[PDB]
Design a protein around this ligand. Structure first.
Ligand code: DCM
Length: 126
């Protein structure tokens, strides 16, 4: 299986979420940002790489957040806690970014796969 890694960046008590711009089925919906692990990379390497490219930040990759999500037979999606080392996030690849609190997480129009993590994210912010 192909692994897709995603980051739950919590800073100053809020969670960063990212609004996809593609493909049409997901454009406008919100996600934890990340991307595919390439063969030869660790999960930490891949996630830090993706968030540097997508957001313009250097992060440290920490513990898993929640369980794996099966995207299909082909791919699996995994979230990690990440924390900021340097930089301020900007939507280089996404439509928008938002910092959200616990109360806002269940109301967000999540991409269907990431929605599974709602209870985990609420707990992390509580
Ligand atoms: N937090 C994320 C990141 C990605 N994906 C999905 C969208 C694609 O089906 C696949 C690979 O993502 P991308 O198209 O961004 O490379 O993973 C997802 O559901 N949730």
């Amino acid at each position: 299986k192909q692994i897709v890694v995603a980051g739950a960046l919590i800073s100053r008590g809020t969670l960063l979420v990212a609004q996809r711009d593609r493909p049409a089925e997901l454009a406008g919906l919100w996600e934890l940002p990340g991307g595919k692990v390439t063969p030869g990379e660790s999960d930490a390497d891949a996630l830090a790489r993706e968030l540097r490219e997508e957001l313009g930040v250097d992060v440290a990759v920490g513990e898993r957040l929640g369980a794996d999500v099966a995207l299909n037979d082909a791919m699996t999606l995994r979230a990690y806690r990440v924390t900021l080392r340097s930089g301020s996030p900007h939507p280089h690849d996404h439509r928008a970014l938002r910092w959200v609190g616990a109360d806002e997480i269940d109301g967000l129009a999540w991409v269907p796969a990431d929605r599974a993590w709602v209870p985990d994210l609420v707990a992390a912010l509580s």
